[PDB]
Structure formats: C-alpha cells, structure tokens
Design an enzyme around this catalytic site. Structure first.
Site, PDB file in Angstrom:
ATOM      1  N   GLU A  77      17.229 -27.350   0.309  1.00 18.19           N
ATOM      2  CA  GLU A  77      16.803 -27.790   1.645  1.00 18.19           C
ATOM      3  C   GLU A  77      16.672 -29.294   1.762  1.00 18.19           C
ATOM      4  O   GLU A  77      16.384 -29.811   2.842  1.00 18.19           O
ATOM      5  CB  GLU A  77      15.444 -27.201   2.043  1.00 18.19           C
ATOM      6  CG  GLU A  77      14.684 -26.507   0.941  1.00 18.19           C
ATOM      7  CD  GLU A  77      14.080 -27.446  -0.085  1.00 18.19           C
ATOM      8  OE1 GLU A  77      13.207 -28.276   0.255  1.00 18.19           O
ATOM      9  OE2 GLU A  77      14.479 -27.332  -1.255  1.00 18.19           O
ATOM     10  N   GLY A 137       1.396 -26.451  -8.311  1.00 18.31           N
ATOM     11  CA  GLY A 137       0.886 -25.536  -9.299  1.00 18.31           C
ATOM     12  C   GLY A 137       1.916 -24.864 -10.170  1.00 18.31           C
ATOM     13  O   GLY A 137       3.098 -25.241 -10.191  1.00 18.31           O
ATOM     14  N   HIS A 197      16.252 -28.534  -5.091  1.00 19.88           N
ATOM     15  CA  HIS A 197      16.008 -28.265  -3.685  1.00 19.88           C
ATOM     16  C   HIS A 197      17.211 -28.230  -2.732  1.00 19.88           C
ATOM     17  O   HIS A 197      17.700 -29.274  -2.301  1.00 19.88           O
ATOM     18  CB  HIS A 197      14.990 -29.283  -3.175  1.00 19.88           C
ATOM     19  CG  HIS A 197      13.626 -29.100  -3.757  1.00 19.88           C
ATOM     20  ND1 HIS A 197      12.559 -28.636  -3.017  1.00 19.88           N
ATOM     21  CD2 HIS A 197      13.168 -29.259  -5.021  1.00 19.88           C
ATOM     22  CE1 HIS A 197      11.503 -28.511  -3.804  1.00 19.88           C
ATOM     23  NE2 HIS A 197      11.847 -28.884  -5.024  1.00 19.88           N
ATOM     24  N   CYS A 241      11.842 -24.087  -6.790  1.00 19.31           N
ATOM     25  CA  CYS A 241      10.760 -24.869  -7.453  1.00 19.31           C
ATOM     26  C   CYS A 241       9.734 -23.870  -7.993  1.00 19.31           C
ATOM     27  O   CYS A 241      10.032 -23.131  -8.935  1.00 19.31           O
ATOM     28  CB  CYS A 241      10.093 -25.861  -6.468  1.00 19.31           C
ATOM     29  SG  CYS A 241       8.923 -27.095  -7.151  1.00 19.31           S
ATOM     30  N   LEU A 242       8.542 -23.838  -7.400  1.00 18.31           N
ATOM     31  CA  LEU A 242       7.514 -22.886  -7.817  1.00 18.31           C
ATOM     32  C   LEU A 242       8.093 -21.457  -7.829  1.00 18.31           C
ATOM     33  O   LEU A 242       7.837 -20.687  -8.753  1.00 18.31           O
ATOM     34  CB  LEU A 242       6.314 -22.956  -6.862  1.00 18.31           C
ATOM     35  CG  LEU A 242       5.054 -22.144  -7.183  1.00 18.31           C
ATOM     36  CD1 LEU A 242       4.563 -22.488  -8.585  1.00 18.31           C
ATOM     37  CD2 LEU A 242       3.972 -22.433  -6.142  1.00 18.31           C
TER      38      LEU A 242
END
Lengths: 195, 415, 195, 415
Positions: A177, A56, A175, A84-85
């Site tokens: 992670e 989203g 990212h 990210c989001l």
C-alpha cells in the site's frame, strides 16, 4: 457482492489498503483486532481477509487481537493476506520465530528478491526482484513447514514474504500500500483476483 | 454592506486590526505571506466542550456566504485543541492540562475585511465607523513563570520513548516541552515580531476574549477546495543558499538524505492514509512526490497529496480524519498519541492542534497550531517538540526544541 | 454503498429481515449482539440499523448484548428500527417498563391500530389499522418521554409501536418480516427510504 | 452397465433388497409411497467425525452421475446426526450420548437399481449375479432394555420448559423420550411393518454395517432441484374422514384452529428464515400458504416455502441452514436447542437429525429422521417427542410421545 475484511491493528496505513481494495472493485470493511469476534467475522463471511500492519508483536495478544485465530481457523477456507504485523502473525501462527531485524527499515525502500521455487498467484507478473517500502524493527525467522519463504531482503537478508503449503495464506513483510512499492497495487490485485 | 477599495488608499492589515482587536472581545487576523483577513464578531463566540465535529456541523447550514476573493467567503474561524482528538481516537487520560482550553473555539464574523494584495483591492463588508486611529502597538513585557521538562527530564522521556521504538511500538513520536511566562502589554507586539522574523503563509492572530493564539504556522494540516482535499507532508530541513550554488548543495543534501527521505516517505504514506478515510477510492494521489521546497530561510522536502472527498463527507470529516498531524504526533498515530500522554507532563491543549476556517461554501483550510504563542488569562505558553526516531539522540532532540523555542522566545520579547 | 446492519439477538426470524433489506436494495450485514463492539459498529458505519427480535428481556444484558448501547449512543445520528426484543430494548433504553403481556401472542395475528397524533415516515401509506403477526410474551409499558406510543393492540390493548421525540429510533412490537404482516414490506421500505 | 426392465418381469423393491441387504455391510432402500431406490456400495462407507458440510463437500466433484429417472441420479446417501448441528450453532455440551453415532454416515453406491413405478420400468445399473433367492424375511424379536424419562420425569421437564416459555425464552420447544430394546432377528421385518402401517413418501432403510436407520419419515427437511429450494412446514393434525362429509368437518377443524394455525405460521416464518440464509433476496416465497393436506390416515395444515439458492451455495449449505427442522427443535431455534440439551437426558444422535441424498447433479432431498428405529449394535432405540407451548399440558404432551412411540413399538413387533 465482493467483500474484503481488513482487520485494523490500530494502524496508520490500513486505509491505504482499503482504498486499493475499493478501487480494485471489492467492498472493504475495516474493523480493529479487538472490535469483532471470530464468530462475528464468520457471520460477515468475507470473500477474503487482510490483516493490517501494526505496532507490536504477534507474540503478545493485545497487539494482534483476534488476528491469530482468524489465521488459524479461517485461513483454510478463506484467503488471508498479512502485512507487517499481519505477516508476522501469519508466521507466528505456524511456528515461526519472531525476532528483531538485523537492520531497521522504517520508511526505507528495500529490494525484495522473490525466491519462490514454484510460481505463486500472489506474485503473478511480478518482477523477480522489485522495490518495496519497509516499516519494521522485527522480522520472522526459523520458518519451517507448513510455511514457505517466498521473498528475501537483498541488503538485510531477512524473510520478506511467506505463504502456507496449502492454505491461501500469504504474508508480506513489506508494504504493497506504500507509494514506495511500485508493484504494490499489482500484488494486491493478484490477491483479490488470483488467490 | 460591501465596498471594494484600493489597497493604496486604505490602511494595511495590522493597522486596521490594531483598532479592531482592541475594540472587540472576539476578533482575528489571518495573513498569507496573497490574502489578508480581518474579521470579528459583535455577538461573541462558540466555546465547544463536545465533539467539535458534531457541534460545528449544526452551524454549517445557516452560514452566510460572502462575495469576496480567497478560500474564505464567510463562515467560521477558530481553533481545534489537540485534545479534541480524544473524541476521534482512544487516548489514555492520565495527565492534567496546563491551562483550561475548550476543545475548540470558533466564531462567525459579523464584519469581514479582505485584502486582495495581488489585486490592490481590499473588500470591506463591514460596519466600520472609523478606519483606524488608535495609536501604535503597545509594549509587551513578560516574566518567566515555569518550564515543563528541563533538559534531563525531557532527555529521559526521549530515552524511554526510544525503547518503544526499538520494540516496534512506534516509528516516530513527537515529544514536546514548553516555557510559560506571565505578561503585561500589547499581545499584538508578538504578532508584529512573528510577521517580521518568521513570516509564513499561515499567520494568525485569534483573540477569544481572555485567550489568544498568535502564531505563524509552518505547516498546513489540510485544505478542501471544491471537494478536493490536499495536504503537503513536510520533512527534512536545510538552510537556504548563500548563492545559486551553495543553495543547490544544500537542496541536494536533502535529496540525498537517506534519513530525511525515510521520515518523509512515512509522512506521505500517513497522509495518503488519512485522506483514505474520507476520499473516493482511487482518487488519493501524490501528484508531486518528494520535491524540495525553498523558503525565505530554510528548505524542506515536500510532497503534494490529494484526494476526492466522498459526497457523504464534510470538511469536518477531513479534520477528524487528518487530526492531529502526523508531524506533531507520530506513527502509528494511535500508539504514538498514547505514548505521548504517557511521557509528557501535561495535556497539550491548543498546541499541536490546528487553527483555520470553514468557508460558508464548504471549502476549508487548517494549519497546524505550532510555532505559536498561546495566551490563556495570566499565562502565556510557548511550546515546541521534536520527532524521535530509532536512532535519535536525546540531547540533540532536546536542542531541537530549544532551537524551536528560541524563536518564540524572541517573538515574545525575551530576546 | 447502502448498508444496513442487523444485530442478531440469536433469532430465527432475523434473516426474514435481511432478505427484505437486500431486496429493498440495501446491503444487509447480520451480526449477533455479542460478536461486535459498539466501536466496531461505528467503524463499519452502517447507514441504518435494525435490532432483531430475540428470546429474553432487555432488562438482562446477556439477552440484548450490545443492543442497548447502540440505541443509546448511535441512535441519535443513525436510524434504528427495533423489532420484538429490539422494540423492547428501545423502550427500556428510554425509561419504559418491561412487563408480561396480558395476552400471549405467539404466532398470532393482531390488529395494530396506529394512534400517532402526528404523521410518521415509518408509517407512510400505512392503513390506520392493519394486521401483523406477534411473537411475544412481554410488552413495553409506562412509556413516557422522550418516547411516544405509535400503535396499539386492538384486542389486547398493549403498546405495539413507539418512537423517539427527536432521534430516528423506532420500535415495533409486531413482525414486519412475517408472512402474516401484509404491509410489513412497506413498513420496512419506509424505514429504509424515508427514515 | 445399464439395463431397463419391465417392472412386471422383475421382482419388487423389498424382494430384491432382501438379498442385497443380507449380502453387503452397506446398503439402503429408499421408497416413495413414485420411485424406489436400491443402492449399495462394494467399497464401504464414510464415517464423518468432523463438520459434515466440509467433509462431504470434498466428495461432490468426482461423484459419477447416473442416467436414471428421479431426483437421485447417483451421488451419496446417508444420514446426518442431530448433533451435527453443533458445528453450525453454539450448543451446550452437557449430556452424554445414548449410543455412539458418528455425526453422519454416507456412502456412494457402486450399484443402483431404480423403480419407476409410474412407468413400469426398473433401471438396473448393477453387477448383479442373481436377482433374488434368499428366502423370506426372518423373524425379528426384541426385549425391553430401558426408557429415558418416564411419565413424571418427562412431565416435569415439560413443566420446567414451560417457565422459559412464560418468561419469553422460547415459543415452542420439542422434548422427546425413548425406549430401547435388545434384539435378535431380521431388521427388514421392521421396515415391512412400517411400509404396512405407516406408509409415506419418505421410507428408508439404511444399513451401515452395525448401524441401521429404518423409518418412515413424516416430514421433509428440504429439497433442492435445479437450484430451487423447497420445504413444507407442517402443523396440526386431524384424522381423515368417514365420508366426503366427516372429512371436511375435520379439515375445517384445522382451518379454524386458532392454536394449530399459530404454530403453523411460526413454522412457516422459521422456514422462510432458514431459506433466507442461503437464498437470493426476494426469491423466498410461500406459493401455497396454510392449505390442508390429506393423507391416508391423517391430515395436516401445510405450506409450500421456496427460494432460489445463491450461486455461491451448495445443497450442503441448505442442509446446515435448515438443520435441524423447526418441528424437532423449537423457536427461537438456538435457545430451544440449548434448553433441550439442558432438559433431556441424552444427546439425540440420529434422532431428529435427517436422512437423504445428494445427487451427483447437485440436486438433493432430506427427510427429518423421526418415526424411525435406530439400531446401533446391541441396542435398538425408538424415539419420539412433542412440541411444548405456553399452554401445553405436561400430561397431554407425555401422551403425545406415548402415542408416537406406540406406532414404533408396533413396527418393531412389541405389539
């Protein structure tokens, strides 16, 4: 003791963040964007906060839940790292625009180019440009103050990282992670110990 | 009581199983293509209608451990329905089931027979009167019943699913379709065909009275051995090689596939994440990252992901943490599963679920329940799916399912 | 690590519970009855749970918030200790009746009389009758199965404690966190280490 | 620069203060009845309209520390409005203020004078031209303005509040009322009267230009000294004794008061709770529990509650953790404060708030802002309240406030 609250935006990468956090010596608490109140978060009083990636856009509240108020209200006195989001929410939260990316990196490794004019704690000991995984169709744009662009995509040329002029709020589009991000652990180590 | 025999003076797995399968309402055969397990209970099974984790958990203490080689030293064998994930995640309940399948069905063997092929010894802890003598495998005839989502119907949901991907609500989602047939005959025939055409290390034939799960799983969900969890994400396929040369040219196609690697990376990250829910921080590692695995027919990009399970955890926790496999659902997994419930016509049931065992010693192994034939009373269902991505072609994807189903069609005798 | 979640029903005694818990070696997390979801609680996965005292009745949801579902859903596999409002909620949750007490003990010390037929972990090493502070106008009554009455008021003769036939759910009408309850610490020690 | 003088060759607190108070817009006098502090700034003050904790926090680092005896070795003096609690707790915002009072007003002394009575030395770190010479205390005349909640109005909210108590929504709640007067003259006169009739260890006179807080606090909110927090819950009153005999008969009335002890116990538990929010687990203790304290006029049941502040904490954290005092709000405190906003007619402002200092060395001391006269521009307000309980008599309670106000009426010259 040391406590990191990780707001889970119904993600499948969030525990990669928790494991690194735990290993970094901090106790991680994972809870979803709609399972705790901003006051309740306050009551837990985490030492820092990470807003996990997720499906989203921050433009839709059901997508980020309590994530935007956390940035807005707690961001000043408690460090926040958005991924990210979360990176997008952090940007949206400060008047940046959310749009589709010119190129779609879904599990693709990009060359992040740090473009910070002045040194950042979060990027201490980090190579001027490194490789990091990307999992996103959307990006942040029209980033103006109080936000500052920190990194950029080499190939795509999209904002890869941002941060607030004075608050301990940081956003990374990539990212840390991910197995694809070599220096990911270090970046997280920095957020935990230097931010 | 127990007796070890020479594999040479015994029958063979399928042979001894023909008799057992036909004699009992509950029996199963697991085969690696290393070990072969024949087990059946004389006391019926377990039909789980509640959270499988809770339910199964209360049976682990009294589980008698057998002195046999292999990861399974007694315990319980069964399957987990894909819909069991509803206990472990928030998923819309809109569609109906194709057939009535409990959330899981397990059984604890009263008798066990283990084939240690590598050693030529078969361990028989069983109350066996005769060894075999039931004649050969019967014929198995089918007749098409229906199909759930023809080419254009499936093609359109693929198109729908693509919007979500473009919008940023999923990276990949697996949409599946199926054919059902009515049947008559010996279901053993199906396994015989599967062992023949698609042998794999994850062969299984589970008979729960009126229901069957007969398949050759292509992928392992997870394995737990002496508290270490391991899973192997798989992505990208290429056929083997004509020569030691054409082979490398294929293997290297995988190695250079920007697309196939991206999908693999995501699966690895997803796998490290799920292990991350129950493993000791700092123990989840990827010892072998993105290596091409060569099979008797194809080859894929493979990774080895492992971690150390927390003491406070079970194999059941690993199950719920990994279920359902990323390759049969999508990413982000919660969204993907909800989008699936939205686009597909029926609840998946055992399909895309998992099947395996919980050893009496805490060790466990579960394979993904795909490339499998599900028989439930009068209906037999062959199910397959394809992982949709941002630049997926609705038609190409349709055919991937057709291609996948062709194999099962064959295994069941349609061709 | 060890974690005790304490649901705060907007109480002024709740931190007396947290301090004892922390001192007993468990990490206490205090959050109010309406700041976290039952799913969110599940996600934190506390080792045990304490439902703090509070104003009101369990008969009214705004008074107990998520407290009743916690008892109902989590009570089977996670130990719960309810105090005052929490003890009442635990009783209400299992069909007991809530009514005004014949006598009003507000900061008054009562003589609790253990009336357990069979030994309880929570009351290990606890005198057959001890002194404990009371802060309540209402009590629990018509306690039938699966609930069992454990203690009783000497002077008042009201139910002072209860517990579930099989779940690790316990209720005490009195206050173990009060300076007025000598053995209070012990009772809590028991809940943490023996329940 | 600094100069220590003999108290004998100096003036006296009030004397040196007359001059200072009349000369500056911002000045204050704190008196213990042990130490006397006269301080004023030449650079104005701090008008806090935001969370006092946040705001004040940013001034603690540059605070210059003075080499003087007493808990205050420089720092900031000021008051916290009762309504500042709105930043630290959810409280209905229904009623209007009586007068306009910032959430807190503090100032950092440019000049300080400390009287070490116990040692006969007054420490003067001040740029003083003259020592005094401003004539005597002027006259101070008032004239009744209004009253907020007459006998039956107050009596009825007490009745209302009693339902909540019966229902189980509070154990005790403090309902207060006030009289306001317009005035002319020397406000110093008020303090002179207060020092005379109701001396106490918590005397203060804070002048923030157009606003004043002149009172003799009966109770201490909290004290922090070298990271140890202490507070003394007080409950139950009895007049002193005619003889070493009638005295004990009174003190023992307290000792045997089932009622007065119950209220005290609750206050102690409430106090241990608030300390519990910022203290190291296992350090919150009650060294002295329920002991009768004898004063120059009355005697009460008293307890000593202490704890060790967490390293991650401030004196500001102690403030927010203890504010407002249980004796001026009720229990459970959140409910009680909301019920108060519901029943009273005006927001309390400085009343029932607190006043004190934050030493430049991190030590702090804050007394409850009651038995105080609040002057704000043209109005002067005398405020008092009574703690309602389940068996409280609406009329008796009315009179407790009347009795409390009689004293302030006297201090202001109404009688």
């Amino acid at each position: 003791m040391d406590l990191t609250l990780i707001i889970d935006n119904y993600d499948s990468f969030v525990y990669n963040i928790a494991q690194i956090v735990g290993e970094l010596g901090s106790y991680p608490i994972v809870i979803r964007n709609d399972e705790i109140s901003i006051k309740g978060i306050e009551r837990i009083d985490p030492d820092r906060l990470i807003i996990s990636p997720g499906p989203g856009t921050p433009e839709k509240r059901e997508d980020i839940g309590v994530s935007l108020d956390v940035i807005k209200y707690l961001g000043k006195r408690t460090p926040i790292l958005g991924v990210c989001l979360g990176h997008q929410a952090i940007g949206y939260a400060f008047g940046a625009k959310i749009r589709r990316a010119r190129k779609v990196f879904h599990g693709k490794i990009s060359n992040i180019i740090l473009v910070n004019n002045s040194p950042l704690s979060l990027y201490y000991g980090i190579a001027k440009e490194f490789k990091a995984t990307r999992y996103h169709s959307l990006v942040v744009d029209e980033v103006h103050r109080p936000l500052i662009v920190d990194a950029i995509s080499a190939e795509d040329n999209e904002i890869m990282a941002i941060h607030h002029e004075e608050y301990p709020i940081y956003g990374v589009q990539f990212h840390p992670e991910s197995v694809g991000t070599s220096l990911g652990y270090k970046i997280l180590y920095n957020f935990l110990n230097r931010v | 009581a127990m007796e070890v025999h020479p594999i040479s003076e015994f029958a063979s797995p399928f042979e001894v199983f023909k008799c057992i399968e036909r004699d009992f309402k509950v029996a199963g055969l697991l085969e690696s293509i290393r070990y072969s397990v024949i087990a059946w209970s004389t006391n019926g099974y377990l039909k789980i209608h509640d959270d499988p984790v809770n339910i199964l958990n209360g049976y682990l203490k009294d589980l008698k451990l057998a002195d046999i080689p292999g990861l399974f030293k007694g315990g319980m064998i069964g399957y987990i329905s894909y819909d069991a994930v509803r206990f472990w995640e928030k998923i819309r309940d809109l569609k109906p089931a194709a057939e009535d399948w409990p959330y899981a069905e397990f059984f604890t063997p009263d008798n066990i027979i283990i084939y240690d092929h590598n050693e030529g010894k078969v361990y028989v802890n069983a109350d066996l009167s005769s060894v075999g003598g039931c004649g050969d495998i019967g014929e198995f005839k089918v007749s098409f019943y229906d199909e759930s989502l023809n080419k254009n119907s499936y093609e359109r949901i693929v198109s729908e699913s693509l919007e979500y991907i473009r919008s940023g609500y999923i990276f990949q989602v697996v949409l599946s379709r199926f054919y059902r047939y009515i049947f008559s005959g010996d279901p053993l025939r199906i396994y015989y065909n599967l062992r023949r055409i698609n042998p794999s290390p994850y062969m299984f034939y589970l008979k729960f009275d009126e229901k069957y799960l007969i398949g050759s799983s292509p992928e392992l969900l997870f394995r737990v051995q002496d508290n270490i969890v391991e899973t192997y994400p798989i992505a990208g396929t290429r056929p083997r090689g004509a020569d030691q040369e054409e082979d490398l040219k294929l293997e290297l196609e995988l190695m250079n596939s920007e697309k196939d690697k991206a999908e693999h990376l995501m699966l690895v990250d997803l796998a490290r994440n799920d292990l991350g829910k129950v493993c000791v921080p700092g123990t989840v590692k990827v010892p072998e990252l993105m290596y091409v695995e060569k099979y008797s027919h194809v080859q894929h990009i493979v990774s080895k992901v492992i971690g150390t399970l927390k003491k406070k955890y079970n194999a059941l926790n690993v199950l719920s943490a990994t279920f359902p496999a990323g390759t049969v659902s999508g990413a982000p997994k919660p969204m993907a599963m909800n989008i699936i419930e939205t686009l597909e016509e029926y609840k998946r049931g055992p399909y895309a679920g998992a099947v395996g065992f919980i050893s009496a010693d805490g060790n466990a192994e579960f394979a993904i329940a795909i490339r499998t034939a599900f028989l439930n009373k009068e209906l037999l269902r062959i199910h397959a799916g394809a992982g949709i991505v941002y630049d997926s072609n609705p038609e190409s994807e349709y055919f991937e399912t057709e291609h996948k189903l062709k194999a099962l069609k064959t295994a069941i005798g349609v061709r």
